[PDB]
Amino acid sequence: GSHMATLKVIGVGGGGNNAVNRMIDHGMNNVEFIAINTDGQALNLSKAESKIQIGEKLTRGLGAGANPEIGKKAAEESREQIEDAIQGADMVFVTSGMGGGTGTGAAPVVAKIAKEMGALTVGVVTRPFSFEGRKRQTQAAAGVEAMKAAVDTLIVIPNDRLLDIVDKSTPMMEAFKEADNVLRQGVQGISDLIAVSGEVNLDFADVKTIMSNQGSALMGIGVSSGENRAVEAAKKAISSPLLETSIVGAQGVLMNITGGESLSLFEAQEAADIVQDAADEDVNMIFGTVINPELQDEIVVTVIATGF
């Protein structure tokens, strides 16, 4: 008997549901998508197969009007419908934009329900742009703290970091796609780890060990070819221009390297050393390797870091 973990991605509120819509468009298989919102108009446009309208008696079908208490009460009163949607999950990713009413208030309730049901629960949330003002930032910070209390692991993306990767003309929607990559590639990295039996094998139990009840996390992937490919891919995997939690200080890392038949012992050590040197801690590594012959000169390094 083999194990095949059930993964679910849950968008909560406006930003979370747009991230879900964009991920569905990008294409993802063997992942269930759930869309949760107070805003019935936006939920009607969701591409997810499971849509949950919360708080209709409270908001009359509108959003939360920037009030986190409304988001929280909305979720609590739809608990049974949220549980039904999560049922069967082995891992749940909850994504939401903090600072509004629905995400801030409802996302921690959703995450708490998932964890109480035994699922490995990961949050990936944004903080608002500074141009949205102090009050939005303060509401968002309270949401982040509530999320921390309710998840196994949390990845925070300050939206201000998007201003570091655009030029004056980059479309807003293109910047948003860059932030979407954090969650999408983290999910895909776990999917790929579960689906393949590696020459040095890691599986969902290793994911649980690295992520259960840990706090902040980093999830990254790097791909490189040619000379110094392993160092370059490892540096890319831990590079964090959009992340609140960098690699620095990590005390546990799951690292998987995938390459073709040319994958060398020496370069696997090089990659492992990059990660641990950048952590600047004594890192408890869980190391894996997959030989994919279809790959020629490409190497892929996946990292999950916790223990901050």
Ligand X SMILES: Nc1nc2c(ncn2[C@@H]2O[C@H](COP(=O)(O)OP(=O)(O)O)[C@@H](O)[C@H]2O)c(=O)[nH]1
Is 132 annotated as a binding-site member?
Answer: yes
3-state secondary structure of 160: helix
Cβ-proximal residue to ligand X, closest one: 97
Sites of contact with ligand X (CB under 6 A) = 13-15, 18, 63-64, 97, 99-103, 126, 128-129, 132, 136, 159, 176, 179
Q: Give per-residue burial for 169-185: e unless 16+ CB within 10 Å, then b.
A: eeeeeebbebbbebbbb
3-state secondary structure of 22: helix
Q: Least CB distance from residue 194 to Ca ion, whole Å?
A: 6
201-240 footprint of Ca ion as x/- string (CB under 5 A): x-x-------------------------------------
Q: Least CB distance from residue 190 to ligand X, whole Å?
A: 22
Q: Indicate the residue among 176 and 204 with the shorter CB distance to ligand X.
A: 176
Q: Indicate the residue among 290 and 305 with the shorter CB distance to Ca ion.
A: 290
Is 103 annotated as a binding-site member?
Answer: yes
Q: How many CB atoms lie within 10 A of CB 219?
A: 25
Q: Which residues contact 305 (CB under 8 A, 6 or more apart)?
A: 217, 218, 219, 238, 247, 250, 252, 253, 254, 275, 279
In order of 9, 57, 199, the CA distances from 261 in angstroms are: 34, 60, 11
By CB under 5 A, which span of 19-27, 138-146, 192-200, 262-270 interacts with Ca ion?
Answer: 192-200
Q: Which does 102 bind (CB under 5 to 8 A by kind): ligand X, Ca ion, none?
A: ligand X
Q: How many CB atoms lie within 10 A of CB 293?
A: 8
Q: Which does 41 bind (CB under 5 to 8 A by kind): ligand X, Ca ion, none?
A: none
Instruction: Give the residue ranges of the annotated binding site for GTP.
Output: 14-18, 101-103, 132, 136, 180
